[PDB]
Amino acid sequence: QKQPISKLTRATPGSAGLDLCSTSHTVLTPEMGPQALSTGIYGPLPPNTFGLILGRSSITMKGLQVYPGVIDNDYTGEIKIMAKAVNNIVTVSQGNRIAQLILLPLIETDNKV
Amino acid sequence: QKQPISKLTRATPGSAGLDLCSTSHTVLTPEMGPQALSTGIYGPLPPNTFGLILGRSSITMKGLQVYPGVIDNDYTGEIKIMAKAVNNIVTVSQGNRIAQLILLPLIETDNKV
Amino acid sequence: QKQPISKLTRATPGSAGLDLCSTSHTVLTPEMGPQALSTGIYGPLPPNTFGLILGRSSITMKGLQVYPGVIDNDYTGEIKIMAKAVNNIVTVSQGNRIAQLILLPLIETDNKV
Numbered sequence: 001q002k003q004p005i006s007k008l009t010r011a012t013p014g015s016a017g018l019d020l021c022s023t024s025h026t027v028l029t030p031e032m033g034p035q036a037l038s039t040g041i042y043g044p045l046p047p048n049t050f051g052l053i054l055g056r057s058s059i060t061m062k063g064l065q066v067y068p069g070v071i072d073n074d075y076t077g078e079i080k081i082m083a084k085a086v087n088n089i090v091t092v093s094q095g096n097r098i099a100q101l102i103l104l105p106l107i108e109t110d111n112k113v
Numbered sequence: 114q115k116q117p118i119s120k121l122t123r124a125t126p127g128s129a130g131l132d133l134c135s136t137s138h139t140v141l142t143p144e145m146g147p148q149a150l151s152t153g154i155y156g157p158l159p160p161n162t163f164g165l166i167l168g169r170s171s172i173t174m175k176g177l178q179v180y181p182g183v184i185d186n187d188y189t190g191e192i193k194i195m196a197k198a199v200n201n202i203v204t205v206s207q208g209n210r211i212a213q214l215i216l217l218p219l220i221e222t223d224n225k226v
Numbered sequence: 227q228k229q230p231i232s233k234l235t236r237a238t239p240g241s242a243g244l245d246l247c248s249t250s251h252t253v254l255t256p257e258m259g260p261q262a263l264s265t266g267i268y269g270p271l272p273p274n275t276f277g278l279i280l281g282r283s284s285i286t287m288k289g290l291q292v293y294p295g296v297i298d299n300d301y302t303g304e305i306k307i308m309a310k311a312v313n314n315i316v317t318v319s320q321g322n323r324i325a326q327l328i329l330l331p332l333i334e335t336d337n338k339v
């Protein structure tokens with residue numbers, strides 16, 4: 001876009017996740033293995049939070065696996081969805097909502113950096 | 114059931130997850146792709162929390178993949194486990210503990226709803 | 227090791243995850259299904275936290291799936307990474323960073339234990 005994370009929207013007031021759509025039309029087959037789908041949405045995240053990319057249930061049930069992804073607080077690049085056709089040929093259309101971004105507290109530890 | 118989430122139990126005091134068993138006997142093959150397993154347990158969740166469904170390690174190691182699922186705070190339907198046989202035929206018996214529900218803080222943002 | 231979790235390091239100040247490497251050389255094929263990779267790193271976790279094991283994006287994109295794993299607060303054994311070659315033969319070398327440990331708040335409920 002570059003579009004910030006503040007332009008994502010959430011389905012309902014109770015929704016845990018911010019919806020992420022692909023900006024591309026993409027056809028995916030099982031033998032293709034993981035593919036990085038474009039979102040046009042960019043990091044970074046609110047202070048003291050990090051992000052988790054997870055699939056939507058309807059999409060997962062339709063045979064498209066989204067691999068859990070961690071977005072770091074200070075990531076400033078494009079948020080991509082890591083996706084794979086499980087059994088069937090899977091077609092993603094431009095603007096389909098394919099994943100969700102969940103925001104979570106970033107816990108501070110003394111681990112060396 | 115309908116059974117609320119307050120009837121789930123946790124393995125040990127330190128357990129992060131609430132145990133979820135299937136209420137059905139189900140046989141799963143790899144070529145079947147994702148299947149939604151019944152739990153008889155229903156949303157909604159404590160205030161300002163959302164839920165994450167994840168597999169148990171022993172089950173995952175036995176060849177049954179549970180796909181991460183997001184339960185929204187205000188979801189009032191039945192919590193299903195999205196499961197797939199990875200390589201082998203997998204048999205689930207009634208009342209086997211197949212997944213776990215982890216509760217997490219729901220972070221409020223200004224994103225449009 | 228036995229090495230505590232306090233010896234893990236994080237890539238950048240903003241990194242959500244603590245890096246986990248395999249201590250073994252391991253070759254993984256798709257027909258092998260899930261394998262538990264050794265880390266030499268042991269629980270337990272900071273008070274009132276639990277742990278989530280997730281893959282790294284580059285590794286996932288290279289065809290190695292890490293299955294999400296839950297580390298309980300009071301787990302005192304070795305943290306293993308549950309991994310599977312998706313399509314291709316995957317080779318893991320000693321000390322490759324293959325996964326990440328994310329720490330999360332442990333929410334207290336009244337569920338029976």
Ligand SMILES: O=c1ccn([C@H]2C[C@H](O)[C@@H](COP(=O)(O)O)O2)c(=O)[nH]1
Binds near residue numbers: 075281282
């Ligand atoms: O599903 C994902 C996973 C990661 N990333 C970006 C954000 C992360 O901050 C960065 C580095 O990822 P890791 O290799 O640390 O997981 O890659 C994504 O866009 N999507």
Ligand SMILES: O=c1ccn([C@H]2C[C@H](O)[C@@H](COP(=O)(O)O)O2)c(=O)[nH]1
Binds near residue numbers: 057058182191194
């Ligand atoms: O593994 C899952 C994922 C989702 N849901 C229910 C709860 C969610 O609030 C609802 C909508 O899911 P999403 O499509 O937003 O992920 O479906 C489940 O029961 N199990």
Ligand SMILES: O=c1ccn([C@H]2C[C@H](O)[C@@H](COP(=O)(O)O)O2)c(=O)[nH]1
Binds near residue numbers: 170297307308
């Ligand atoms: O990916 C994983 C998942 C689990 N465990 C260990 C830590 C958990 O506390 C313990 C029991 O796991 P569950 O069966 O409750 O998920 O196994 C791991 O080392 N790695």
